[PDB]
Amino acid sequence: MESNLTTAASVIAAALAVGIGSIGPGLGQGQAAGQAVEGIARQPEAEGKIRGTLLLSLAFMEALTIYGLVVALVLLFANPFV
Amino acid sequence: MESNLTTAASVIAAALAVGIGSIGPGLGQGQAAGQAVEGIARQPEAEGKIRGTLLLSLAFMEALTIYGLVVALVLLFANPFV
Amino acid sequence: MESNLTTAASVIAAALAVGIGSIGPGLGQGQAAGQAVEGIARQPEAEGKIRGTLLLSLAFMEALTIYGLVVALVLLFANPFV
Amino acid sequence: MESNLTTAASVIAAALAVGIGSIGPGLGQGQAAGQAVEGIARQPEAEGKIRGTLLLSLAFMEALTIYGLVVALVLLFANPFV
Amino acid sequence: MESNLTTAASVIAAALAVGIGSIGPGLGQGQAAGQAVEGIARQPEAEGKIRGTLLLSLAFMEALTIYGLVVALVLLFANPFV
Amino acid sequence: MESNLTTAASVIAAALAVGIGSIGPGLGQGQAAGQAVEGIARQPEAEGKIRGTLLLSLAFMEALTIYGLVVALVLLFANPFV
Amino acid sequence: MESNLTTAASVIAAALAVGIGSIGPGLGQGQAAGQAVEGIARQPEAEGKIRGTLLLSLAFMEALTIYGLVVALVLLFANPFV
Amino acid sequence: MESNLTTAASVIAAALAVGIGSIGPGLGQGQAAGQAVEGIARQPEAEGKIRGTLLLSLAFMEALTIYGLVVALVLLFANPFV
Amino acid sequence: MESNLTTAASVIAAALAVGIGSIGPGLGQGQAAGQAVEGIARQPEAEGKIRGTLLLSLAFMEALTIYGLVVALVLLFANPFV
Amino acid sequence: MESNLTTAASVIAAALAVGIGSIGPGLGQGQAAGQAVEGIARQPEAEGKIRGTLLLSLAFMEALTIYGLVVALVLLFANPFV
Amino acid sequence: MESNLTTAASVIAAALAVGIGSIGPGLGQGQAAGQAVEGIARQPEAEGKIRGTLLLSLAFMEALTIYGLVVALVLLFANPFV
Amino acid sequence: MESNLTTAASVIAAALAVGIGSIGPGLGQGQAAGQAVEGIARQPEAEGKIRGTLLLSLAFMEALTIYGLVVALVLLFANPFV
Amino acid sequence: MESNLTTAASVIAAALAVGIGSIGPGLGQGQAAGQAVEGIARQPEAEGKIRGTLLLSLAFMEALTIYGLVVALVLLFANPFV
Amino acid sequence: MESNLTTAASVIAAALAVGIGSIGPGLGQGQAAGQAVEGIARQPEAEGKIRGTLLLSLAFMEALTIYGLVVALVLLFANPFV
Amino acid sequence: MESNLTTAASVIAAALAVGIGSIGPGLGQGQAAGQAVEGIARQPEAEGKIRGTLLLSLAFMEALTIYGLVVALVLLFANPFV
Ligand SMILES: OC[C@H]1O[C@H](O[C@H]2[C@H](O)[C@@H](O)[C@H](OCCCCC3CCCCC3)O[C@@H]2CO)[C@H](O)[C@@H](O)[C@@H]1O
Ligand SMILES: OC[C@H]1O[C@H](O[C@H]2[C@H](O)[C@@H](O)[C@H](OCCCCC3CCCCC3)O[C@@H]2CO)[C@H](O)[C@@H](O)[C@@H]1O
Ligand SMILES: OC[C@H]1O[C@H](O[C@H]2[C@H](O)[C@@H](O)[C@H](OCCCCC3CCCCC3)O[C@@H]2CO)[C@H](O)[C@@H](O)[C@@H]1O
Ligand SMILES: OC[C@H]1O[C@H](O[C@H]2[C@H](O)[C@@H](O)[C@H](OCCCCC3CCCCC3)O[C@@H]2CO)[C@H](O)[C@@H](O)[C@@H]1O
Ligand SMILES: OC[C@H]1O[C@H](O[C@H]2[C@H](O)[C@@H](O)[C@H](OCCCCC3CCCCC3)O[C@@H]2CO)[C@H](O)[C@@H](O)[C@@H]1O
Ligand SMILES: OC[C@H]1O[C@H](O[C@H]2[C@H](O)[C@@H](O)[C@H](OCCCCC3CCCCC3)O[C@@H]2CO)[C@H](O)[C@@H](O)[C@@H]1O
Ligand SMILES: OC[C@H]1O[C@H](O[C@H]2[C@H](O)[C@@H](O)[C@H](OCCCCC3CCCCC3)O[C@@H]2CO)[C@H](O)[C@@H](O)[C@@H]1O
Ligand SMILES: OC[C@H]1O[C@H](O[C@H]2[C@H](O)[C@@H](O)[C@H](OCCCCC3CCCCC3)O[C@@H]2CO)[C@H](O)[C@@H](O)[C@@H]1O
Ligand SMILES: OC[C@H]1O[C@H](O[C@H]2[C@H](O)[C@@H](O)[C@H](OCCCCC3CCCCC3)O[C@@H]2CO)[C@H](O)[C@@H](O)[C@@H]1O
Ligand SMILES: OC[C@H]1O[C@H](O[C@H]2[C@H](O)[C@@H](O)[C@H](OCCCCC3CCCCC3)O[C@@H]2CO)[C@H](O)[C@@H](O)[C@@H]1O
Ligand SMILES: OC[C@H]1O[C@H](O[C@H]2[C@H](O)[C@@H](O)[C@H](OCCCCC3CCCCC3)O[C@@H]2CO)[C@H](O)[C@@H](O)[C@@H]1O
Ligand SMILES: OC[C@H]1O[C@H](O[C@H]2[C@H](O)[C@@H](O)[C@H](OCCCCC3CCCCC3)O[C@@H]2CO)[C@H](O)[C@@H](O)[C@@H]1O
Ligand SMILES: OC[C@H]1O[C@H](O[C@H]2[C@H](O)[C@@H](O)[C@H](OCCCCC3CCCCC3)O[C@@H]2CO)[C@H](O)[C@@H](O)[C@@H]1O
């Protein structure tokens, strides 16, 4: 077992990196998704093209929070200091 | 039974990750869903294409918060430090 | 009757997780529900399609807060450290 | 009687759990309910479909706070530490 | 006339419970009622249905703040620690 | 005369319980009132029904802040600790 | 002439109650009044029914802040503790 | 020339009460006044009815801040403790 | 000269009283005045009725800050403690 | 070159007075002037009336920030304590 | 060289007096400018009158931040204490 | 397993870099993509152009959060101090 | 080479002045510019009158931030104290 | 290795520089890019003119963050103090 | 390898200046750019006039952040004290 400052900072850091990490993307995806379904009702014929661009967008946004997830796991599993 | 700083942090870290980490995704899902039923109401014939594109979005968004859940479960059940 | 830091941290943590945890999803569910009723007033024939999609959405949002409910219940009944 | 740090944290925790845990669902129901009635005015023949779907959603949000309540009640009546 | 940390946290917690706990429901209700009177003016003939559903929502919202009151009262008249 | 922590926490608690207590309801009532007068201009014939539902609403909202007022007076006049 | 903590708090408590306690009600009244004169302008014939329903609202809202005023006067002129 | 805590607390308290105290009512009065002039431009014949209702509203809002002015003046000239 | 805690609090207090006490009325007048002129443009023959009513309201808000000013001036020139 | 708490609070208070004291009037004026130039474009023929009332409002708003300047100058050139 | 508290408070004060000082006017001017150019596109004939009233407005707003600038320079160059 | 201030600041900085750094891009992208799917529904025939420019923007925005990741990685895998 | 409090403040003061001092003016300029190109697009013939009135505004706004820049350069290059 | 206060400040500083420095430009690009595509949909023949101008602006904002990046990289790889 | 307060203050200061410094201008540039593209879609013939005005605006906003870049670079490479 270990318990210095760094271990403590590490676990908090981990949590913040995904907690704060998901706020922007959280909102972002909601926005895009909303527009796409509204679009799909307007032009059902256009669903595939829309579904396609939505996904491209959803990728980019989810990547942002995964960067936090990645940092979090380096801090818990591959921690460079403790 | 253990108690030090790192354990105290670990539990606060847990809650923040899962708590904070829900703010964005939750607002986002509400936005996406609202638009979809509004969509369905406009063009009922398009329900399926909407329900489908919506399930897509919801997963991406939900997954965002599931990253925080993961971090919490590690901190609680597979802690590297304590 | 133990009262170290980690017990006081736990109780605080359990509260935050489930309290902060409900903000986004509480708001979002309202957004979704609102559109659904406005929808049902516009196309009462589409009630069931609307109702089903809404019900699905609500579950997705309800989960988000349930993750904070699960972390809280571990911290109270399955506490790893104290 | 007993007045350690954990009993102190426990009272505050219990209050935070329901004080904050109501903000989200509090706004949410008001949005949903507002929509409902406005719809009922525009389309009175849909009252039962509206009212019904509305009632459904209302439950979901109400639960979001009842989770905070539950935690509060444990921290008070079934406290695991003090 | 006993005075300790736990008694101090108890009076503060009591107020925060009830006090913060009004913000959400207070706004939410205004929102719902605003729509109702607007609706009642658009379709006086629907007043009954509108009044009826409004009362339903009010109740659901009032109950959110009552939970805070409930805690406040426990902390002040059935405090488990002091 | 008395002056421990609890007396001090008590007086502050009292103030917050009504100060914060009135914010939500404060806004809420403004909203509903506004809509009702706007409604009354639109359908003067409908004034009684409107005036009726407004009042029902204004009750509910004022009750929320009175819960704070009640806590405040227990803290000043029926204080359980000091 | 007295000075301790509880007296120092009592005065800060006073101001907060009356200060904070005005924020909501003040915004709310502005909203209600604005709508009423706008109302009056639209349908001048309906002045009286508006003036009347408005006086109603204003009282409920004003009363909210008067609760804070009461708490302050007690803290200053009928203090239980100091 | 006394300078205990309670005198420094008083001066701070007097300032807050009258400063914070003016935020809501300052905003609200503007809201009301705005509608009133926009109104008078729409129905110059209704000027006096509008003007009278406005004048009444303004007084209600002005009181709110005057309560913070009264607490301030006690704290400076009728201070109970110091 | 003299530099106790109360003189220190007194300068800050005096500044807070007018710095904050202007925010509310500051926005309020701008809203009111904006409306006024816009109305005058739409309905120039109403200039005197507009301008007059506007002037009235402007006074009311201006007073809200003059209260902060008054307090400031007392804390500075007629200080009851230091 | 005297230096004490009261002199430090005096320089800070001076800046906050003038600095914070600009936020409200600054926004308010922009608002009022924005309407005026918009109005002057809608009805060039009314420029004179519009310019005239705008100047009135500007003055009322400028005076709010001047109060802060006034305090700033007293604290810096006629400080009563140091 | 000099370095007491006051020198330190002085330099910070200076910075805040212009930093915070420019926020309101910063926004304010943007608003007015925007409206004036929008106005100028609408009524090019009316450019001179508009350009005139804009400038009058821009003066007033810039003066607010100069009051901060003035305080800042008294603090750095004509500092009354240090 | 070294632990010092600099190592603690390093884990926290790493998380804040990536975590805070997502807020802007996350929202921005949602905004951009929301418009794209809306556009693709308005003019399916333009999908190609719309998709193409959207990808350009996404890239520019993704690169903003990547800078934070980059720092996070330096601090964690090429830390210059520890 | 010097180091004390006043020098440490001087550098933090510098950044705040130039950093904070850009917030308002930056948002304001964006607003003014946006409106102008929108203006130009509507009435291309009026470009010059817009470009001209815009340059005017931009200078006033930019100047606001230049006050903060000045304060920083003094603090760094012509410090009165250190 | 070395772990003074300046290395600690240096890591945090470097993270703040890019975490915060992205918020502004992050939202900005999303707004700009959203507009762009929406325009391209309405007016596909203008794609190259739109896309081009858009690209231009995108650079400008991207630079705003690259400045934070640059600072970060200096504080890390070319640190002037530690 | 010096590490006094003023070096740690410098590094923090450099970061803030350039990070906070980019918020307003980052947002504002987006606002301007958005209007410009929407504009170019409305009047592709006006592209060059629009494009030129935009380019001018962007430079004005870019400067604002460049002032924070200049203060940062002094603090790192031309530091007056340390
Ligand atoms: O006190 C002796 C210990 O001191 C060092 O760290 C000490 C340090 O001195 C002390 O300030 C620290 O308490 C500081 C509490 C800071 C709380 C902080 C708040 C936000 C970020 C996360 C948590 O505890 C450390 C425990 O290791 C060493 O790391 C440790 O090996 C050594 O035994
Ligand atoms: O200083 C006494 C001893 O304290 C150390 O740990 C101490 C540490 O220094 C101290 O800051 C800590 O109390 C600090 C309380 C901070 C509360 C914290 C804030 C946010 C995160 C959750 C809660 O207690 C530790 C108990 O493990 C170690 O036991 C030992 O190295 C050291 O000698
Ligand atoms: O009961 C004695 C225990 O002391 C330690 O905790 C100490 C700790 O050192 C001390 O800083 C701490 O006071 C620190 C107050 C921090 C407030 C904290 C903020 C987050 C939410 C909970 C409240 O009190 C503890 C009392 O137990 C250890 O946690 C524990 O191992 C040990 O047994
Ligand atoms: O021995 C006398 C009693 O003292 C203890 O409490 C002590 C405690 O150690 C001390 O930190 C405490 O001062 C701590 C001040 C904390 C302020 C608090 C923070 C959140 C809630 C509102 C305000 O004072 C208590 C005494 O009034 C114990 O709580 C109690 O069991 C014991 O009987
Ligand atoms: O260190 C002395 C005692 O420490 C513990 O409680 C101490 C604690 O350390 C101390 O920080 C505490 O005062 C510190 C202030 C606590 C603020 C906190 C903020 C949110 C949660 C509620 C209150 O007083 C307690 C009085 O018992 C335990 O009672 C026991 O380990 C030990 O007797
Ligand atoms: O210091 C001796 C006294 O200690 C206890 O309380 C002490 C306590 O120790 C001390 O931390 C406390 O000062 C703590 C100041 C906390 C200020 C707090 C901030 C927000 C909530 C309201 C006010 O003063 C109490 C005065 O009673 C007992 O209550 C008292 O009987 C005893 O005489
Ligand atoms: O510790 C010394 C003595 O202090 C006690 O009271 C002390 C108390 O402990 C202390 O925290 C307090 O100073 C604390 C200053 C906190 C400022 C407060 C914060 C928010 C509410 C308004 C202002 O002064 C009291 C004076 O009555 C009692 O006089 C006595 O029991 C004790 O022995
Ligand atoms: O003049 C000596 C007086 O000391 C006490 O107050 C002390 C107190 O103990 C001490 O914590 C206090 O320093 C505490 C600083 C708290 C700052 C406070 C925050 C709220 C707004 C006002 C400023 O200084 C007082 C100086 O008087 C008592 O209030 C008074 O009975 C006694 O006569
Ligand atoms: O004896 C030398 C002088 O010292 C006293 O002030 C002392 C005081 O006791 C002490 O708390 C003070 O440090 C207190 C630091 C408080 C920071 C302050 C908070 C708000 C306003 C801006 C920053 O230092 C003063 C000395 O520079 C008295 O104020 C003065 O009358 C006396 O002549
Ligand atoms: O305790 C020493 C002195 O305490 C009083 O003033 C003390 C006070 O206690 C102390 O907290 C204070 O420094 C404490 C910092 C005060 C911060 C406060 C925050 C907002 C209001 C303005 C500043 O310094 C004073 C210097 O005189 C009185 O001057 C006198 O009772 C006594 O001589
Ligand atoms: O410590 C001895 C010195 O004490 C006085 O001031 C001392 C004072 O005691 C001390 O609290 C102070 O440190 C207090 C640090 C407060 C930081 C503050 C935070 C916001 C406002 C700007 C900065 O340092 C002063 C340096 O002069 C006298 O001014 C000085 O002549 C004397 O030599
Ligand atoms: O107290 C020891 C000595 O400290 C004095 O200066 C001290 C001062 O007291 C102390 O608060 C200070 O450390 C205070 C650190 C506060 C950080 C500050 C907060 C915001 C503004 C930027 C950073 O260091 C000074 C070094 O010049 C003087 O050197 C001397 O008069 C005194 O005897
Ligand atoms: O001697 C052991 C080591 O201790 C020093 O660091 C000490 C330092 O003095 C002390 O203030 C520190 O406690 C300070 C707590 C500050 C909390 C911090 C604030 C922002 C970043 C997250 C949390 O503890 C360190 C020990 O763990 C040095 O940093 C290091 O070089 C040295 O080798």
Ligand SMILES: OC[C@H]1O[C@H](O[C@H]2[C@H](O)[C@@H](O)[C@H](OCCCCC3CCCCC3)O[C@@H]2CO)[C@H](O)[C@@H](O)[C@@H]1O
């Ligand atoms: O005073 C002891 C040492 O002080 C300096 O660093 C000290 C410093 O004074 C102390 O406040 C510090 O702990 C204090 C907490 C610092 C918080 C800060 C907040 C944002 C920036 C990052 C962290 O620990 C250092 C450990 O080295 C220098 O290392 C050196 O002058 C000396 O050896």
Ligand SMILES: OC[C@H]1O[C@H](O[C@H]2[C@H](O)[C@@H](O)[C@H](OCCCCC3CCCCC3)O[C@@H]2CO)[C@H](O)[C@@H](O)[C@@H]1O
């Ligand atoms: O290296 C020893 C140096 O000590 C002084 O600074 C001391 C100072 O007294 C002490 O309060 C300080 O700890 C204070 C911690 C304040 C944290 C601060 C917050 C703003 C951003 C940067 C971090 O540590 C310094 C360590 O150097 C002087 O600055 C310098 O003249 C002297 O040479």
